Design a protein around this ligand. Structure first.
Ligand SMILES: CCCCCCCCCCCCCC(=O)O[C@H](COC(=O)CCCCCCCCCC)COP(=O)(O)OCC[N+](C)(C)C
Ligand SMILES: CCCCCCCCCCCCCC(=O)O[C@H](COC(=O)CCCCCCCCCC)COP(=O)(O)OCC[N+](C)(C)C
Ligand SMILES: CCCCCCCCCCCCCC(=O)O[C@H](COC(=O)CCCCCCCCCC)COP(=O)(O)OCC[N+](C)(C)C
Ligand SMILES: CCCCCCCCCCCCCC(=O)O[C@H](COC(=O)CCCCCCCCCC)COP(=O)(O)OCC[N+](C)(C)C
Ligand SMILES: *[C@@H]1O[C@H](CO)[C@@H](O[C@@H]2O[C@H](CO)[C@@H](O[C@@H]3O[C@H](CO)[C@@H](O)[C@H](O)[C@@H]3O)[C@H](O)[C@H]2NC(C)=O)[C@H](O)[C@H]1NC(C)=O
Lengths: 53, 119, 432, 60, 84
């Protein structure tokens, strides 16, 4: 959450993607946000913060 | 060979996003997806970038054909695009978008095209 | 399929289509030679209410249900030949019709298409039969027939139909299809799960919900553009739009500790009124979208529970069921009441048929044997403001088991000190 | 589910065309003392609480 | 069936609780002192008296009193946090 007022527009679009998308569907974002998309939006990413391969 | 960072810089080596950006920066895939409807938002047809502190005019961003916008959040912080499914007749997805988007350039043009042999 | 012998002289249907449920009344006047009524199949597993009056009384004749299926009306005293009687009948379905241009756009009127039969269906000889159709402001008929005698004629924001002097005993082979104009989200929950904790040491009752709601309206043609919605918010003159932005449930009288959580966190855009509770989703629901959330609050026991008169260990509880948004239609809703520990149950009743009933147990905080008594029971197809009712449970709760909670904690502490006593005074030296 | 299904666990929701094998790529010990505290509060002391509240209040 | 219960519901009187809800945070801190005194003196006498019978006697009695005040302490101390 990013604070004279609130800015909560970073959890709208993970819960959109949890409610309104079919359950086997791949998301392709840059590797900084890999853990949050898998944890909070619950889909199957292509990269994450491990930088293994 | 395919990608080189000598091309995203302007003349005499400055990185910027303005109306004098590069020719291969304006045609990239992460430029078109960020500044899509950003000049049509503000009044008069001009906009401030608020971070880079540069000014954008609605002729500087071309339209994309192969993707389409599905959800865009409140303060324009996360934007979600979707791959458009392939064309059911073999046509390239740039040509159908150019056919729909530009109903001008009518002509007769009776000339035989230059094709290869049907094998 | 057994019929009987009767005869009616009037028949006045008037379908009202003004909410997310289609509500009609008929006024019949049946004369001489217990009374049956007939339903088209497919509109029998959507019926959600049934009733019968006398034309001037304030009573309610009893009635129930059970390929044309039937329903039964009784009579309070008797029936006599060469005698007429007039009655009305109300009914509430669970159908709305489908949006006829499927992909509307953003800010347009939406139209609905609904189809039924034109002539009456009842198994008896009809003398005169009218048909009226009140509700929306713009009606039209879809695929009209060629015969002039059964078209409809409009006046005063309603339709009218022909008086139609002779109708045979049993014939329903003629249809219609109306397109009307509607402006509302017209949402429905898919299932609900409400549960009621009924603590007794401290007084309070507390309620929890779990709404899984969706929207049945017309989808968007081209995507979802944000700035066009900003242009709608900038210049506002109407509430005629078909997506939902706020919604408000009505609460009991003095409610204390509200919260509006979610499945991903805790949404913080919600403020109370004297009796209402206005909530807002994270994103506006546009007609094929879903939203799953959770509301809860708390009250006082001293107006939901009455101790019996000639005793001190018999209690009677009466719980409201289904207090929610003002216009919504619930498909299946299941209730669950958690009585306090070590109670026994005598009888349970409700004014609405209750498909199943079950009694189990469930453990909770500082609960060290056998759990709370949970009793759960289910419903199906019931609407907001027409099926509210109460539910009555009678139970007993002795003074013996009222004092067993601190003795259970105290017996675990007492059996925890003796282990330190035995462990502390015991020889473990290896030298002499 | 069980502790036997966690030591050798192949998840196919990360690095998608070639999923990662977790049991030889992470350090157990932060998870298993937490499942131990959950198993002790739920069965012995008598009070059931959620796994999210055990995970938030694990450092203080 | 419904009418006997429904006329038996309006024929009754309301519910009077045993201890009002705004009083219990006084009994909480008024219990937490006494149980710490009694239970502390219970575990204090486990030292070397070198007399087994009177040590088991005093320890058992003060453990009983400390237990029966710790129970009421945690029941009243749980209703004033918001978990009933
Ligand atoms: C990894 C840890 C697991 C240990 C399991 C056993 C736990 C024993 C805990 C002992 C508690 C302390 C009390 C103690 O001092 O006992 C030890 C105790 O001395 C010993 O260590 C002997 C214990 C083992 C007994 C041998 C049987 C084999 C055990 C099964 C494998 C003996 O030392 P002391 O006899 O006290 O030393 C001399 C006496 N002074 C007065 C000088 C102190
Ligand atoms: C001097 C020598 C001292 C030796 C000290 C040994 C202390 C270890 C005591 C551990 C007690 C475990 C008790 C237990 O069974 O709790 C379980 C399982 O709980 C766990 O997941 C954590 C236990 C994992 C054990 C780790 C291997 C043993 C490491 C110490 C030898 C709860 O986990 P659950 O995830 O709920 O399910 C586990 C699988 N079941 C079969 C049980 C369904
Ligand atoms: C001498 C006293 C003995 C010990 C006192 C016992 C403390 C009581 C708390 C027990 C654990 C409660 C954990 C908890 O989840 O509480 C939170 C609400 O969260 C809270 O408010 C808990 C705050 C507790 C503060 C604890 C202070 C430190 C105590 C350590 C000794 C409520 O969440 P829910 O369980 O979701 O409540 C609604 C669900 N109902 C079933 C009740 C309808
Ligand atoms: C080992 C030492 C560990 C110490 C840890 C210290 C932690 C400090 C931070 C604690 C967090 C505060 C918890 C908390 O939220 O308590 C508040 C307000 O609660 C109260 O009203 C105070 C009641 C205190 C009762 C005394 C209990 C003593 C026993 C505890 C071990 C709850 O009150 P409210 O939020 O107002 O809930 C309203 C419920 N009513 C029934 C009153 C309407
Ligand atoms: C949020 O609420 C919805 C609405 O109830 C929940 O959806 C439920 O589960 C599935 C989707 O997970 C819905 O579709 C079903 O999918 C299965 C696939 O196995 C298919 O076989 C079924 O025929 C059906 O199409 C289902 O309709 C729906 N309702 C139920 C089961 O009653 C969803 O689970 C909720 N929670 C989220 C998104 O976290």
């Amino acid at each position: 959450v990013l604070p004279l007022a609130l800015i909560d527009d970073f959890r709208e679009a993970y819960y959109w993607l949890r409610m309104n998308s079919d359950e086997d569907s791949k998301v392709a974002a840059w590797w900084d946000y890999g853990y949050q998309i898998g944890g909070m939006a619950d889909r199957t990413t292509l990269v994450d913060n491990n930088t293994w391969n | 060979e395919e990608i080189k960072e000598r091309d995203f810089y302007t003349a005499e080596g400055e990185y910027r996003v303005d109306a004098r950006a590069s020719e291969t920066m304006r045609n990239s895939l992460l430029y078109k997806m960020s500044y899509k409807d950003f000049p049509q938002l503000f009044n008069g047809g001009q906009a401030t970038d608020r971070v880079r502190q540069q000014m954008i005019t609605p002729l500087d961003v071309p339209p994309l054909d192969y993707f389409d916008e599905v959800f865009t959040s409140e303060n324009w912080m996360v934007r979600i695009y979707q791959l458009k499914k392939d064309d059911a007749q073999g046509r390239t997805l740039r040509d159908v978008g150019e056919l729909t988007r530009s109903s001008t350039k009518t002509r007769r043009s009776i000339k035989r095209p230059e094709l290869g042999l049907r094998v | 399929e057994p019929p009987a012998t009767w005869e009616n002289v009037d028949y006045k249907r008037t379908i009202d289509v003004s909410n997310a449920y289609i509500s009609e009344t008929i006024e019949i006047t049946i004369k001489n030679i217990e009374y049956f009524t007939a339903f088209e199949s497919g509109i029998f597993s959507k019926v959600s209410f049934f009733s019968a009056y006398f034309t001037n009384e304030a009573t309610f004749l009893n009635s129930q249900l059970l390929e044309i299926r039937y329903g039964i009306i009784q009579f309070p005293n008797a029936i006599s030949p060469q005698e007429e009687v007039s009655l009305v009948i109300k009914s509430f379905y669970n159908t709305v019709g489908i949006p006829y241009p499927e992909h509307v756009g953003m800010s347009e009127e939406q139209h609905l298409l609904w189809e039924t039969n034109r002539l009456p269906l009842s198994a008896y000889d009809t003398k005169k039969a009218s048909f009226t159709l009140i509700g929306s402001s713009s009606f039209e008929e879809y695929h009209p027939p060629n015969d002039e005698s059964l078209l409809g004629k409009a006046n005063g924001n309603s339709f009218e139909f022909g008086p139609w002097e002779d109708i045979p005993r049993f014939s329903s082979n003629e249809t219609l299809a109306i397109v009307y104009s509607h402006n509302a989200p017209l949402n429905q929950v898919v299932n609900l799960r409400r549960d009621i904790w009924l603590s007794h040491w401290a007084s309070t009752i507390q309620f929890e919900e779990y709404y899984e709601l969706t929207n049945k309206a017309a989808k968007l043609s081209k995507g979802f553009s944000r700035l066009e919605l900003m242009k709608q918010i900038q210049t506002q003159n109407m509430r005629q739009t078909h997506f939902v932005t706020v919604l408000d449930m009505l609460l009991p009288e003095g409610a204390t500790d509200h919260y509006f959580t979610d499945l991903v966190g805790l949404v913080s855009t919600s403020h109370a009124e004297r009796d209402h509770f206005f909530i807002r989703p994270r994103f506006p629901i546009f007609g094929g979208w879903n939203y799953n959330f959770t509301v809860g609050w708390t009250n006082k026991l001293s107006d939901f529970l009455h101790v019996s008169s000639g005793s001190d260990e018999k209690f009677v509880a009466s719980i409201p069921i289904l207090n929610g948004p003002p216009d919504t239609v619930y498909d299946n809703v299941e209730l669950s009441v958690f009585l306090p520990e070590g109670a026994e149950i005598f009888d349970i009743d409700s004014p609405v048929p209750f498909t199943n009933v079950s009694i189990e147990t469930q453990k909770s905080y500082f609960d060290l044997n056998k759990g709370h008594v949970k009793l759960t029971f289910s419903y199906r197809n019931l609407i907001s403001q027409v099926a509210n009712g109460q539910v009555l449970i009678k139970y007993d709760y002795p003074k013996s088991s009222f004092f067993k909670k601190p003795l259970s904690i105290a017996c675990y502490i007492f059996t925890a000190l003796m282990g330190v006593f035995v462990l502390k005074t015991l020889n473990m030296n290896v030298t002499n | 589910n069980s502790f036997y299904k966690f030591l050798n666990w192949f998840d196919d929701r990360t690095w998608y065309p070639l999923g990662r094998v977790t049991g030889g790529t992470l350090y157990p010990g932060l998870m298993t003392t937490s499942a131990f505290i959950w198993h002790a509060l739920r069965n012995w002391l008598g009070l059931p609480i959620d796994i999210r509240n055990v995970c938030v209040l694990f450092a203080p | 069936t419904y009418e006997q219960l429904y006329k038996e519901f309006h024929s009754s009187k309301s519910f009077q609780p045993f201890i009002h809800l705004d009083t219990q945070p006084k009994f909480a801190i008024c219990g937490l002192i006494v149980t710490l005194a009694v239970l502390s003196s219970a575990l204090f006498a486990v030292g070397s008296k070198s007399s087994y019978i009177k040590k088991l006697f005093f320890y058992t009695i003060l453990s009983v009193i400390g237990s029966l005040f710790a129970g009421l302490t945690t029941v009243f101390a749980s209703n004033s946090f918001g978990v009933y």
